[PDB]
């Protein structure tokens, strides 16, 4: 649903770079280049941002709205 706040294996906070990662994928950057410039070093806390789906945005279109 949402990006996890901490990693599952080690426990490093990777929930503070999802918006930065999204903003970095539109400035003519490579996936690996952006992931290395974000601050991730190993593949322990790198798969949380690379392979991650965003379904809450699709779930907000069905959310109740006030009129």
């Amino acid at each position: 649903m949402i990006i996890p706040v901490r990693c599952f294996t080690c426990g490093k906070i990777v929930g503070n770079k999802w918006e930065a990662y999204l903003g970095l994928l539109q400035a003519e950057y490579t996936e690996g280049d952006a992931l290395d410039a974000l601050g991730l070093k190993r593949y322990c806390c790198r798969r949380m941002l690379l392979a991650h789906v965003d379904l809450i945005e699709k779930l907000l279109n069905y959310a109740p709205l006030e009129k």
């Binding site: 109740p64 709205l65 006030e66 009129k67």
Partner: protein, 47 residues
């Protein structure tokens, strides 16, 4: 006592059902209603 407030699923209007009346909405023509959230104090654990 206080009128039981209910919300619709198409226009989301806060209406009330009085007694044994046709269950519908007074603004739209939708025939399904929802309920509000309780105003009590619930305890949750963050562990």
């Amino acid at each position: 006592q206080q009128p039981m407030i209910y919300i619709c699923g198409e226009c989301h209007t806060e209406n009330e059902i009085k007694s044994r009346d046709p269950i519908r909405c007074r603004e739209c023509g939708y025939r399904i209603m929802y309920k509000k959230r309780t105003k009590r104090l619930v305890v949750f654990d963050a562990r």
